[PDB]
């Protein structure tokens, strides 16, 4: 069972800085190449840095727009490899993904989940959550029902309907961001003979402010 | 640095037939050791990048028999098979022969279907917003197919450019349809003013308009 997973993004002030970890398991870390590769618009995928293996001597890579601002680092004993970045600037806001050539020709095998670094000075606020009912009365055949998740900071939230229960009819769109920062819409399209029967809830996660919120869709 | 170039920004194929997209080096990558290192990365939308292929042609463990890749020195092949409507997203070659190591800017897949018109939902502002000060009237514009779709705001007959966000899915992995959201953000006092408002959107599969409205005495 390979797997790559990344922790310690978020939300960081320009100038600041910010350790990312990625712990392996499921191959052999020890005999692999380490690498990081990040995402933007504009950029697209980007490689970063890389740290190799100790029969290499531990060698590091780094692209040039980040030598001497960002350090990669291993721990062979806890099968880890950290990314300690400095004096972060608004370009380097992405995901960032660790990935790794388990063996010599391999190619990057293994990725990770990607983790959000947003670079930024505005600061960390909780969405609020609203039920978005249709108008009239049903039929026909299926009803849309929405929910609006504004005014939050930093990406991302997830939300889930019914916990996770109702995922087929579900379309969950892009954030747009503008003056009340964060505005995120998801729908939700069940038969008409689900709602308003049945109870269909709208489950939203701001893990930046740890704020867990649960709408319930009401006929208005 | 090692240019990589993926001509194409999209290529548009039916489920069941054959294509190929292509990717170009700036120089060899032709390794002293005699190994050629081009790699394909497939990402889905909303995942991480996934291998397909290393070194030119030898396909990862659990990488679909349908895909495929030739070539050498400076000009390389990603191809299917058979094309399957769960096939969407990016794919992109990638040069590790020389540092910095440089990926393509990748080519998305697109999948042909039958025209699809949009089902278009309109919701006034919930009574727990108003009471907050605030007044977003929404409008998804779902499942549809062509991508292209154009939204309109009209509050009283006139139309309302500014306070609009818009934001677009990916095509679905299922359906091969496209979705839209358009919300009309508003204040409270704002929205009292007016008492008809409506999103119009217009499509291909529609000669006329596409509206839903509603009125806010009501
Ligand atoms: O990434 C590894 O090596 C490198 C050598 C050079 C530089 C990029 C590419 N050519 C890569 C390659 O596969 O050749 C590797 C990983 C595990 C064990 C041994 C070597």
């Known amino acids: 069972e390979v797997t790559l997973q990344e922790s310690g993004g978020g939300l960081v002030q320009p100038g600041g800085s910010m350790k990312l970890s990625c712990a392996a398991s499921?191959?052999?870390?020890?005999?692999?190449?380490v690498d990081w590769v990040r995402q933007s618009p504009g950029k697209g995928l980007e490689w970063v840095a890389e740290?190799?293996?100790?029969?290499?001597?531990?060698?590091?890579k780094y692209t040039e727009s980040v030598k001497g601002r960002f350090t990669i680092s291993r721990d062979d004993s806890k099968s880890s490899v950290y990314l300690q970045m400095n004096s972060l600037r608004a370009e380097d806001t992405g995901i960032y993904y660790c990935?790794?050539?388990?063996?010599?020709?391999?190619?990057?095998?293994?990725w990770g989940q990607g983790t959000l670094v947003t670079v930024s000075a505005a600061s960390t606020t909780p969405p609020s959550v609203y039920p978005l009912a249709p108008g009239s009365g049903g039929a026909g055949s299926m009803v849309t029902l929405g929910c609006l998740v504004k005014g939050y900071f930093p990406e991302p939230v997830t939300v889930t309907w019914n916990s996770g229960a109702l995922s087929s009819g579900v379309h969950t769109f892009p954030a747009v961001l503008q003056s009340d920062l964060y505005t995120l819409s998801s729908s939700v399209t069940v038969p008409s003979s689900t709602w308003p029967s049945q109870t269909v809830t709208c489950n939203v996660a701001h893990p930046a402010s740890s704020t867990q919120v649960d709408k319930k869709i009401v006929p208005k | 640095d090692i240019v990589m170039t993926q001509a194409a920004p999209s290529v548009p194929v039916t489920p069941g037939e054959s294509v190929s997209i292509s990717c170009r080096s700036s120089?060899?990558?032709?390794?002293?050791?005699?190994?050629?290192?081009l790699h394909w990365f497939l990402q889905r939308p909303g995942q991480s990048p996934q291998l397909l292929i290393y070194?030119?042609?030898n396909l990862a463990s659990g990488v679909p028999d349908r895909f495929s890749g030739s070539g050498s020195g400076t000009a390389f092949t990603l191809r299917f098979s058979r094309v399957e409507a769960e096939d969407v997203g990016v794919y992109y070659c990638?040069?590790?022969?020389?540092?910095?190591?440089?990926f393509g800017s990748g080519t998305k897949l697109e999948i042909k279907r039958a025209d699809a018109a949009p089902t278009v939902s309109i919701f006034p502002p919930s009574s727990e917003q108003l009471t907050s000060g605030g007044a977003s009237v929404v409008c998804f514009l779902n499942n549809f197919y062509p991508q292209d779709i154009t939204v309109s705001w009209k509050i009283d007959g006139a139309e309302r450019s500014s306070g609009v966000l818009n934001s677009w899915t990916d095509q679905d992995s299922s359906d091969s349809t496209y979705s839209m959201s358009s919300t009309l953000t508003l204040t409270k006092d704002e929205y009292e003013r007016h008492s008809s408002y409506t999103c119009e959107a217009t499509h291909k599969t529609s000669t006329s308009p596409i509206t839903k409205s509603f009125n806010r005495g009501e």
């Open positions: 990935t790794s050539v388990p063996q010599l020709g391999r190619g990057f095998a293994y």
């Open positions: 499921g191959f052999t870390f020890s005999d692999a190449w």
């Open positions: 740290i190799r293996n100790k029969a290499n001597n531990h060698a590091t």
């Open positions: 120089k060899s990558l032709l390794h002293s050791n005699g190994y050629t290192y």
């Open positions: 070194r030119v042609s």
């Open positions: 990638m040069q590790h022969l020389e540092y910095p190591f440089t």
